[PDB]
Amino acid sequence: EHIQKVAIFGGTHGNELTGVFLVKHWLENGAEIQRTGLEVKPFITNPRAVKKCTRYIDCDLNRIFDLENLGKKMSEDLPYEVRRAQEINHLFGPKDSEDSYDIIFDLHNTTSNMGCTLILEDSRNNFLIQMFHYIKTSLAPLPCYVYLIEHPSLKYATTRSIAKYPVGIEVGPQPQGVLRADILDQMRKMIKHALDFIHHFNEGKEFPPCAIEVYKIIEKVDYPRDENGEIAAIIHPNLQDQDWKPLHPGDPMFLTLDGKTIPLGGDCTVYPVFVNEAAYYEKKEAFAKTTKLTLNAKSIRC
Amino acid sequence: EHIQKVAIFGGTHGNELTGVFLVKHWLENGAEIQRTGLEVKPFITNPRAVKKCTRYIDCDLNRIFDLENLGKKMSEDLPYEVRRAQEINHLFGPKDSEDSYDIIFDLHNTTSNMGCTLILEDSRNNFLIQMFHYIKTSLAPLPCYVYLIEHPSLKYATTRSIAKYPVGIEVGPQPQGVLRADILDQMRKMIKHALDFIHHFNEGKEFPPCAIEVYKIIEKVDYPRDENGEIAAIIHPNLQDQDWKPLHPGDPMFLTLDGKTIPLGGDCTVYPVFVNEAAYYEKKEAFAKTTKLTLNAKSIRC
Ligand SMILES: [Zn+2]
Ligand SMILES: [Zn+2]
């Protein structure tokens, strides 16, 4: 059924600059992101954090789009981002209402070496699975991985979760507060292909069943802390930059300043992602342990 | 003349983590940085910026070690880093007194792709030139570059400039707020060799005249800005990560989102350094243009 309202959000985290740059340019000339019979609105979600070139002002914008915050009485005392979440929800939602935007792409960067990443929230979601498959195939031979979040709560609080079909776009490695040409080119391409898909679907194109490989988070792995709770070992050079690649029971994982290796253990293979992400220091995380699985989509047709 | 007081400073910028990690470990176990008949003191220069994992709190510590700040009446209303500069200057200085520390290494990281870098402030400084030559030779085949700052004011304001022999140690690429193993192993190797040098000098070893190549900044090059003063093009993919390598009048330098290349121009070769450093966005700088020159040292002997 016909897709009408599409947004591309940038600056959810103010120091992830690829999104900010694109959206700002598109707000002056949207030609690249328009499709015949499709309105795409670019929007900067966190202006204050973008001016300060900072992750957030008062709290993470990408973690509060839920009934607890979006439903509390509007007030000058409320943390900036809460205040902002309610504005965004009024513009592009209300979340869960039939009037809400159909598809939102929320753009993000990581310091991890992940390349092009799509983030999926519903594991049972044929339309989005189909889209991700289309993107994957278009980027080839450029790799493109799909990261799967499966809350047994069935609830999400991400900025994009306003949409009927939320799409997370993440590209790394890029230092925060830095704009790399290569990274910008990758994200552009992903967007170009995502919009091609929407457009083709709206033109009534048929899509046979398809399958994608996804990586589902099973555990946040923390750094070894010491007596005082301080980081006591660091990501081993062998693991560094090896996001998505298999890591076995034997393999090096941490290195201590005194020079010893701490190996994986457990007794099956895992797929580290978000290996050494800047934002995951404070929030105690060296990487995420993921399982690799296949999702299937039924054929779809508008 | 005999070198007694040596300091290694970490956390001058709170979110350059290599220095912070080493210094903190050394404060628990200094064995690796001790030498026979040589006392080396590790110190964390910017504790609050290190706790908040942030470049600074009120202003850049590395920018205010000068008469204008170091000489103002101590009070609780002074910017934190000013207070802290006074504390530091009294512990390891007073800057310009005969009692001040002899050598200070200030540890730093850059998001630029510079590898191991030594920063020199006096261009006419035999003892330092001799040291840098030793460290370069020692590291080889690992590359190691010397960056030369030459103020016609004759005045410096860096944290390390308290010492009779200030030494800047910078290693990249590393995103802020991230600890990479390879980068840590590089910095510690540089330190290991610097301290070997001092030790050998103290043992009365002779050093013949020597020469090093250095890179002296001639101009901070800014991003093209638009009518509103906003960044309008970005570091060209060809220039990205090509710190130290020669860039000629023809060569690509910036890329616009609309896809055009902005070439170097002028009419001689230059050596880009600090290409795309996070800290230099606000501070209006895409990279530093440098000339390559040769410094000569007379023979030295304790
Ligand atoms: Zn983000
Ligand atoms: Zn620094």
What do these coordinates show?
Chains A, B: This is Aspartoacylase. Chains A, B: Homodimer. Chains A, B: It is found in: Cytoplasm; Nucleus. Chains A, B: Its EC number is 3.5.1.15. The first copy, chain A, is α/β, with parallel strands linked by helices. Chain A folds into two domains: 254 residues, Aminopeptidase (3-Layer(aba) Sandwich), CATH 3.40.630.10; 48 residues, N-terminal domain of TfIIb, CATH 2.20.25.160. Helix content of chain A is 23%, strand content 24%. In chain A, a hairpin with a 5-residue loop joins strand 9 and strand 10. In chain A, helix 5 crosses helix 6. The longest helix of chain A has 22 residues. The N and C termini of chain A lie close together (5 Å). The interface between A and B is medium-sized, with 32 and 33 residues. Bound molecules: zinc ion (2 copies). The site of one zinc ion has 4 residues of chain B, from loops. The site of one zinc ion has 4 residues of chain A, from loops.
Strand order within the widest sheet of chain A?
A: 2-1-3-6-4-5-7-12-11
Count of the domains of chain A: 2
CATH class of the largest domain in chain A: Alpha Beta
Which range best describes the helical content of chain A: under 10%, 10-25%, 25-40%, 40-55%, 55-70% or over 70%?
10-25%
Helix and strand pattern of chain A: EHEHHHEEHEEHEEEEEE
Radius of gyration of chain A: 20 Å
CATH architecture of the largest domain in chain A: 3-Layer(aba) Sandwich
PDB class: hydrolase
Keywords: Canavan disease, N-acetyl-L-aspartate, Zinc-dependent hydrolase, Aspartoacylase family, Aminoacylase-2, ACY2, aspa, protein structure initiative, PSI, center for eukaryotic structural genomics, cesg, hydrolase
Assembly: dimeric
Entry title: Crystal Structure of an Aspartoacylase from Homo Sapiens
